[PDB]
Write an enzyme that holds these catalytic residues in place. Structure first.
Site, PDB file in Angstrom:
ATOM      1  N   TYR A  33       0.955  -1.128  -0.073  1.00 14.52           N
ATOM      2  CA  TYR A  33      -0.044   0.023   0.103  1.00 14.52           C
ATOM      3  C   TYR A  33       0.706   1.264   0.158  1.00 14.52           C
ATOM      4  O   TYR A  33       0.847   2.122  -0.783  1.00 14.52           O
ATOM      5  CB  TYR A  33      -0.930  -0.158   1.226  1.00 14.52           C
ATOM      6  CG  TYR A  33      -0.538  -0.106   2.688  1.00 14.52           C
ATOM      7  CD1 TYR A  33       0.218  -1.355   3.104  1.00 14.52           C
ATOM      8  CD2 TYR A  33      -0.330   0.846   3.453  1.00 14.52           C
ATOM      9  CE1 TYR A  33       0.843  -1.524   4.259  1.00 14.52           C
ATOM     10  CE2 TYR A  33       0.304   0.723   4.837  1.00 14.52           C
ATOM     11  CZ  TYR A  33       0.885  -0.584   5.117  1.00 14.52           C
ATOM     12  OH  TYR A  33       1.521  -0.581   6.446  1.00 14.52           O
ATOM     13  N   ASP A  91     -11.520  -8.509   2.530  1.00 15.84           N
ATOM     14  CA  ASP A  91     -10.179  -8.531   2.808  1.00 15.84           C
ATOM     15  C   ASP A  91     -10.398  -8.432   4.598  1.00 15.84           C
ATOM     16  O   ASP A  91      -9.064  -7.950   5.058  1.00 15.84           O
ATOM     17  CB  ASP A  91      -9.185  -7.970   2.253  1.00 15.84           C
ATOM     18  CG  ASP A  91      -7.832  -8.504   2.476  1.00 15.84           C
ATOM     19  OD1 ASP A  91      -6.652  -7.872   2.462  1.00 15.84           O
ATOM     20  OD2 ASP A  91      -7.734  -9.943   2.836  1.00 15.84           O
TER      21      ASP A  91
END
Ligand SMILES: CN(C)c1cc(-c2ccncc2)c(-c2ccccc2)nn1
Ligand SMILES: Fc1ccc(-c2n[nH]cc2-c2ccncc2)cc1
Ligand SMILES: [Zn+2]
Length: 339
Positions: free
Chosen positions: A31, A146
């Protein structure tokens, strides 16, 4: 426009406004990089995430836009929200980096389940906060997809908030079986399955389905919940999966009261409603909040839903420059929430 100052932490450069001081690396990953900082305007400890290569590919550019659109829309105590979003660039032409700011959360649910064995009262409060945030997320027609302990931020107050080959995870112990079977029409209750796996881990201290791969993961799941019955079988379209599940050894559904011995019978009853193979019969987040397990925390007048969320961009096939320009528009148009 504020004044920006530059410095190099780890191997990444950071160009943030002057209001954020004492930047300290707290984590990193695919990320991006997150730094803890002190916000002098509000006196709060904040987390500043610098997105990594936000516009290196169409996948990156669209994902950058999607994260910003999501974070700008979530306004809920149990979901991570945006305190600020900025870029050091002065125009669209120089727009290269994106920084996101939220309240600093000190740890996640993994740093708590490993360090201690949670009591039943702590499990009630933590799972209630997850489901309260899930009801909000699901009410906006959003699926998390997720949910896992590392995606659940928790502070000392036990307050909880929900957060190509890059970032590849081999096996997801918290993924619903219908995704493991690559079903394309999975619903919001895939998140409820993950909550059941998380809640089981908090009650026993062990990973419920620690599979080695996708095939091993299914075998571990079927050993507890049993092989699909006839009603579920009628809903499997892919012959490859239908013949596979019929060719496998027929496992019966185990008694959850025998698996989760000594646990609160209210908690076992909830786990039985969450860890159901058929997603049509899985309990929803709103229904789970009314379960007797959360009798001391449940408040129907204090479990709000979300404003409508426009997901029409998800089906769009734009260029990198277009996703970039759309993201820049969202950065400038951002208004902070009241102090
Ligand atoms: C993948 N992961 C563990 C995280 C953690 C955080 C984080 C949030 C709050 N406090 C500490 C860290 C963030 C984050 C998101 C938006 C802004 C800033 C940080 N993003 N990803
Ligand atoms: F082994 C399994 C595991 C999960 C399922 C399932 N539950 N809800 C929906 C499905 C499903 C899976 C694959 N194709 C259609 C539907 C079906 C069989
Ligand atoms: Zn990538």
């Amino acid at each position: 426009r504020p004044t920006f100052y530059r410095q190099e932490l780890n191997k990444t450069i950071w160009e943030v406004p002057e209001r954020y001081q004492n930047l300290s690396p707290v984590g990193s990953g695919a990320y991006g990089s997150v730094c803890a900082a002190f916000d002098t305007k509000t006196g709060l400890r904040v987390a500043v995430k610098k997105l990594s290569r936000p516009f290196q590919s169409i996948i990156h550019a669209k994902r950058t836009y999607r994260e910003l659109r999501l974070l700008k829309h979530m306004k809920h105590e149990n979901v991570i929200g945006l305190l600020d979003v900025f870029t050091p660039a002065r125009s669209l032409e120089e727009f290269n980096d994106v920084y996101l700011v939220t309240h600093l959360m000190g740890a996640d649910l993994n740093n708590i389940v490993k360090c201690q064995k949670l009591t039943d009262d702590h499990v009630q409060f933590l799972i209630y906060q997850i489901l309260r945030g899930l009801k909000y997320i699901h009410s906006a027609d959003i699926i998390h997809r997720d949910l896992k302990p590392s995606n659940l931020a928790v502070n000392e107050d036990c307050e909880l908030k929900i957060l190509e080959m890059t970032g590849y995870v081999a096996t997801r112990w918290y993924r619903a079986p219908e995704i493991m079977l690559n079903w394309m029409h999975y619903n919001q209750t895939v998140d409820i399955w993950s909550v059941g796996c998380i809640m089981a881990e908090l009650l026993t201290g062990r990973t419920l389905f620690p599979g080695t791969d996708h095939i091993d993961q299914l075998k571990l799941i079927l050993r507890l919940v049993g092989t699909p019955g006839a009603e579920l079988l009628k809903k499997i379209s892919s012959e490859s999966a239908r013949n596979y599940i019929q060719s496998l050894t027929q496992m019966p559904k185990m008694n959850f009261a025998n698996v989760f011995i000594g646990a609160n019978p209210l908690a076992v009853d909830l786990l039985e409603k969450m860890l159901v193979l058929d997603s049509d019969k899985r309990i929803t987040a709103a229904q789970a909040l009314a379960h007797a397990y959360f009798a001391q925390y449940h408040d129907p007048d204090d479990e709000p839903v979300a404003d409508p969320y426009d997901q029409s961009f998800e089906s769009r096939d734009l260029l990198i420059d277009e996703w970039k320009s759309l993201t820049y528009d969202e950065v400038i148009s951002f208004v902070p929430p009241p102090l």
